Amino acid sequence: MAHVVILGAGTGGMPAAYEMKEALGSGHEVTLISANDYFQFVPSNPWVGVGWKERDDIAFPIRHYVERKGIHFIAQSAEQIDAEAQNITLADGNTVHYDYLMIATGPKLAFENVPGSDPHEGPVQSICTVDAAERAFAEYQALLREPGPIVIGAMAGASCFGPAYEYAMIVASDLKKRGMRDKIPSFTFITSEPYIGHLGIQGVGDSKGILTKGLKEEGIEAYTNCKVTKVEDNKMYVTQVDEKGETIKEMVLPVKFGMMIPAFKGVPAVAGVEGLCNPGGFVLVDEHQRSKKYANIFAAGIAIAIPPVETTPVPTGAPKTGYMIESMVSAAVHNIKADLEGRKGEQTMGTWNAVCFADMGDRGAAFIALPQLKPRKVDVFAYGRWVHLAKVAFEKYFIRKMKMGVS
Ligand SMILES: Cc1cc2nc3c(=O)[nH]c(=O)nc-3n(C[C@H](O)[C@H](O)[C@H](O)COP(=O)(O)OP(=O)(O)OC[C@H]3O[C@@H](n4cnc5c(N)ncnc54)[C@H](O)[C@@H]3O)c2cc1C
Ligand SMILES: CCCCCCCCCCCCO[C@@H]1O[C@H](CO)[C@@H](O[C@H]2O[C@H](CO)[C@@H](O)[C@H](O)[C@H]2O)[C@H](O)[C@H]1O
Ligand SMILES: [S]
């Protein structure tokens, strides 16, 4: 008999647990450990961040749902991982042994990369978590009562650009739907992208033209090839570069309300394991989702490392999105079950791809790109009411599955 532990109940983690339990059966122990006691649908966070959805709409208590499925659940953060002894030290000092480990910890939001940028230290906020986006909203209403400049975008080293655009548009939108838009001194978009709608994938479809035009229609000035050196005194210090990295200018932007997509790092407990991860803190796995340094550690999701295909003037990364994360999960599950049965698992993540959906209210934007390098086999960007319909349906679907189980 084996004890399988899945760390982190997020987009890859909640499913991995349901699946793992399915694949193994009453024969083995499955344990899901996560920092928070509830699950959250991430894609819905920008909407919380502007106040279109409540927390209670996009999150729920994990415990009951997984335990009714034979899965043990610990609402506790992993502080330490000993890959040698194969023990996990919890927040509360308790420890947990495993036979096989599956890491699904998602990202560390590397605020520290830009001093002052932490949502608790200043006006630059975050919509990556429900707590943070609830925070953003608060500050947004502070802006409402007392209008000042707005800065939205993505930090240097970011890899998740879509939600920035989405957030900019929906904020723009929401102001008008309050008429308060013309009360705004300036509305600025700042991004590490070498051009608008690069999205960390060298553009998909006509993302350059459509996003460029959108920001213009909304009276949002856009700068590219930017990094924020520091936030300070409610001011955003910004350096802009050329294709070689030399400086073409430096800005000081007053911020009254802002949101910048931070760079993702591996979380501490995972990055801390010696030999496990790259300098970013991302787990170095093989095509079977198995660590190259520990045979009984697998990884899926944002937590895993993926080599860069392009090097941009200001550091940027490629996003790791839903569909590909599911492939990662299921492969790892199969390869682990195979490990408790003699075989080596042959299953893989599949072809690299990115799929993203943004809802602006009545209609939405979406893209599909695969594989990672152009020319691609699929390169599509779409806008339309039907995208909105799909996001709503997919959110409803995914949340139900996370209560009923998967297989
Ligand atoms: C705002 C935004 C919008 C996005 N929208 C889309 C989109 O539209 N479509 C799509 O395909 N992708 C979307 N994504 C990208 C991606 O799919 C999500 O970020 C997704 O949640 C990634 O899943 P994950 O399992 O890898 O990480 P997460 O969902 O964040 O899960 C990681 C889990 O591990 C936990 N954890 C971390 N450290 C510890 C620890 N020490 N101990 C215990 N638990 C720990 C966390 O609490 C969390 O529960 C979006 C990303 C962002 C942030
Ligand atoms: C998914 C993540 C990446 C992006 C996140 C957020 C993106 C921001 C949204 C920008 C869209 C704004 O601009 C909008 O785009 C499309 C351009 O094709 C226009 O729409 C145009 O093409 C569509 C079909 O695709 C037609 O239905 C429409 O009749 C036509 O006018 C809209 O008239 C314009 O209002
Ligand atoms: S993303």
The domain containing residue 290 runs over which residues? 1-407
Q: Whose CA is nearest to atom 1 of ligand 3?
A: 160
> Which residue is it, tokens 């970011």?
158
Experimental method: X-ray
Is the Cβ atom of 162 under 6 angstroms away from ligand 3?
yes
User: How many whole angstroms from its chain centre is CA 87?
Assistant: 27
CATH number, domain at 10?
A: 3.50.50.100
| Bridge partners for 111 per DSSP | none
User: How many whole angstroms from its chain centre is CA 120?
Assistant: 20
User: How many whole angstroms from its chain centre is CA 214?
Assistant: 23
> Which residue is it, tokens 């409610």?
234
Question: What is the spatial distance between Cα 161 and Cα 208, in angstroms, rounded to a whole number?
Answer: 13
User: How many whole angstroms from its chain centre is CA 277?
Assistant: 18
* Tally of domains within the chain: 1
Question: What is the spatial distance between Cα 380 and Cα 317, in angstroms, rounded to a whole number?
Answer: 20
* Sheet of strand 3-7, all strands in order from the earlier edge strand to the far edge: 72-75, 29-34, 3-7, 100-103, 297-299
Q: If you measure from the C-alpha of residue 106 to the centroid of ligand 3, how many angstroms do you get, rounded to a whole number? A: 12
**Which ligand does the CA of 161 lie closest to?**
3
Q: 322 labelled as ligand-binding?
A: yes
Q: 17 labelled as ligand-binding?
A: no
Give whole-number Cα distances, 200 to 259, 281, 349, in Å: 18, 19, 20
User: How many whole angstroms from its chain centre is CA 395?
Assistant: 16
Q: 11 labelled as ligand-binding?
A: yes
Is the Cβ atom of 160 under 6 angstroms away from ligand 3?
yes
Question: What is the spatial distance between Cα 347 and Cα 331, in angstroms, rounded to a whole number?
Answer: 5
